[PDB]
Structures are given as structure tokens and as C-alpha cells.
Amino acid sequence: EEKEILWNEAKAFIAACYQELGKAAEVKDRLADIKSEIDLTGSYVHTKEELEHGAKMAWRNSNRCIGRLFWNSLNVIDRRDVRTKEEVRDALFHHIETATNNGKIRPTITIFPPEEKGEKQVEIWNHQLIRYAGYESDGERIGDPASCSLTAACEELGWRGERTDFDLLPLIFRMKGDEQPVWYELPRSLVIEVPITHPDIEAFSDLELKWYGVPIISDMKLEVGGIHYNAAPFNGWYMGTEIGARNLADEKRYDKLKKVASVIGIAADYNTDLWKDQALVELNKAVLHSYKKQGVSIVDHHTAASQFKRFEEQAEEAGRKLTGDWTWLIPPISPAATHIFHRSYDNSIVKPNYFYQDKPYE
């Protein structure tokens, strides 16, 4: 069965890919070469062109993604050549540097050797390359709760965090053959952080909030024509709400609304006052203002939704069926102010794509 699944996925993918690249005539010959190669090695290897475009197709088919308008400009880094943990480490270090680009963030994906027989060559433990640790012991809550299990896992392996609310977790990953993963402290010079300040409420700085510049997902598998790249970290820039409406606001995350309500000078006593709503808006204004002032890319949810509308229009013009997840595409603040809220979307899964995968710790 396994051999056949790969072949079927490859026929579908190559034809679709070469079709877009104006290479429909090369499909016959390429499929042959692939069919012999699977017949031989139990698998096949993508050409650089097939890989770069499959990465892009995969972004375009991400139903939960509002920022898809720029799918075609994804910067793809082909690192299928790495064999050593120093090489993986440096590749990750580099991806951070190049994607950050001094604040002018470039959407980038680094692609490591794929699973062989389901066997991973490189196994990244990070959820994101850049993330804050989290600690909960003796009712004492420090940092990001979402990171608690990975934090303890690191501390099993001999890492120790300073236990501020913003400890950068180290990179942690395991190579095929090693029973344990390795960890490397992130160089502070590679990581941009943005202190949160409000455009005109000076007291807002007293909260001493901050967030990292670049969200770099490293826990999803890229599947491209039957080939499974379990290790392919990718990034864009942030939409302001992700920091202001979720990461800093959620009760299960940094839970800062009451404190925000205090510094913006309103009461947090009555539901009918809409204090949470109001704190939410000011905090999200703070996040947007702060990133802009630092010269770090970021998009507000109105602009993002405007962009996404162009993406729907563009898909219609190209004759491509559009797919999406309404429940993720709506922003968690003022959703009814975007066009997204008022239409619906077909949530079908089209390949290539990115798929969540089980993490080894817990």
C-alpha cells in the first residue's frame, strides 16, 4: 500500500506544479523518472523547482491562514543537505537572521531532509524557533504557560532559565540515531524584541510587556507530493491581534487585561462597562504602535483582511477553487468589521499543505 500512496500523490502534485510553471510537456518524462525511482529506492527526490513551488502551494492551501496573498513570494531555503547537528543549528540560526532582516521581515521556510520510512532525520522540539519559557510550581506562575511542558523538558536536559517572564527557550532538536536531543542557547543578537508602549498613555510602559519580532513555526510537517518534510520551519510577520488579543490577553497565556485596565485608567469591576473590550483595543493599539516604531514588520487585522480579499479575488481570476477555515480566518477582535465574517469558506484539505504533528515530549 505505502508505495502506491506515494506514487498517487506524486502524479497529482507534479502535474499540478508543472502546469502552473508552464512545463506541462515535461510531466510525462518526469513522472517516468519518478516511477522508476520509487520502484528502486522506495521514494523519490524533488527538484529544487518542485520543492520551492510545493512550499508555496502549501502556504496557499493553508485554510487557517489570512496572510496568503503573498504565497508566491515565499523565500525557500533548500537545506536537504545537512547531516550534522552543528549544521542544523547553524541553518536555524541563519533562518532567524535572514527572515528577520533587521525588522523588514521576509517570509521564509528552511527545508530539512524528509522522513524516510516515516523515520525522521531531524526532529525539532520547538513549537516556534523563538519562544518564551513558562514555569508553574507552588502556585507560582512565571512566563508563558503555553510553554510549560517544553520548558520542563529542556530543564531535564540540563538547561536552566532565569525565570523572568520572558526567558528565551533554547533551540532543542534530536537527530536520527541520538536517543536524546541537543539544545543551544539562542544568541541575543539574533533575536529582535519589541517593548510594548502606547501611543499616548505613558503609564503603559509600567507593565513592562514585550514580544519577539518574528513568529517562526517549527512543529508542522510540510507534505509535498507524498514526501513528508517533518522539519520545515517557516515564518511570516505577526498580525497585531495574535500578540494583543491572544498571547498577552488570554487567561491561559499572559493574562494582562486587568493590568491593562488599570494603566489605561478604567475600572475592571462591571461586565456592562466592557472593560475587557476596551483594554483589548488599547493593548492592540499598543502592539501595533510599538512594532511600527521599532521598524519591525507587522500587519493590523483590517489591512490583513483587505489583503485576504485580494487573495480570494486572485484565486477566482486564476480559476483556482478557494479553501479556508472561517473559524481561524476571522480575527479575535472586531471580526464583524471584516468581509471575512460575512461570507463562508470551503474547509477542504488540498495538498501540498502544512499539517500539525505529535510532539515527542508529552
Ligand X SMILES: C[C@H](O)[C@H](O)[C@H]1CNc2nc(N)[nH]c(=O)c2N1
Ligand Y SMILES: Cc1cc(N)nc(CCc2cccc([C@H](N)Cc3cc(C)cc(N)n3)c2)c1
> Would you call 242 a catalytic residue per the annotation?
yes
Q: How far is the CB of 328 from ligand X (least distance, A)?
A: 4
Q: Which residue in 7, 71, 237, 275 is the catalytic one?
A: 237
> Would you call 237 a catalytic residue per the annotation?
yes
Q: Say if residues 6 and 41 touch (Cβ distance below 8 Å).
A: no
Q: Which residue in 68, 79, 131, 174 is the catalytic one?
A: 68
DSSP 239: B
> What SS3 class is residue 111?
strand
Rounded Cα gap, residues 265 and 113, in angstroms: 53
Show contacts with ligand X in window 325-354 (CB under 6 A): 327-328, 341-344
Comparing CB distances to ligand HEM, the nearer of 161 and 215 is 215
Q: How far is the CB of 94 from ligand Y (least distance, A)?
A: 18
> Would you call 154 a catalytic residue per the annotation?
no
Q: Which residue in 7, 30, 52, 65 is the catalytic one?
A: 65
Across the chain, the runs of DSSP E, i.e. the strands, are: 75-78, 108-111, 122-124, 134-137, 140-143, 171-175, 182-184, 193-195, 210-212, 216-217, 220-224, 227-229, 234-235, 353-356
Element (H, E) at 75: strand 75-78
Could you say whether residue 362 binds ligand Y (CB under 6 A)? no
Rounded Cα gap, residues 323 and 138, in angstroms: 46
- 285: how many CB neighbours lie within 10 A of its CB? 18
Comparing CB distances to its own copies, the nearer of 6 and 288 is 288
Location of C-alpha cell 507534505: 223
Could you say whether residue 87 binds ligand HEM (CB under 6 A)? no
Task: Give which of 280, 284, 279, 333 is closest to 305, Cα–Cα.
Answer: 333
Q: Which residues bind its own copies (CB under 8 A)?
A: 240, 245-246, 249-250, 257, 271-274, 276-278, 280-281, 284-285, 288-289, 292, 300, 302-303, 306, 326-327, 330, 332-337, 341
Q: How far is the CB of 72 from its own copies (least distance, A)?
A: 24
> Would you call 71 a catalytic residue per the annotation?
no
| C-alpha distances out from residue 208 to 164, 166, 194, 299, 350, Å | 12, 11, 11, 22, 43
Q: Which three cell numbers stand for residue 173?
A: 532538536
- 353: how many CB neighbours lie within 10 A of its CB? 20
Candidates 79-87, 108-116, 195-203, 213-221; binding stretch for Cl ion (CB under 5 A) = 213-221
Q: Which option in ligand X, ligand Y, ligand HEM, none does residue 66 bind, with CB closer than 5 to 8 A by kind? A: ligand HEM
Binding site for ligand Y (CB under 6 A): 215, 217, 234-236, 238-239, 242, 356
> What residues are annotated to the active site?
65, 68, 237, 242
Binding site for ligand HEM (CB under 6 A): 59, 62, 64-67, 70, 74, 107, 109, 234, 236-237, 239, 242, 299, 304, 328, 354
Known binding residues for heme: 65
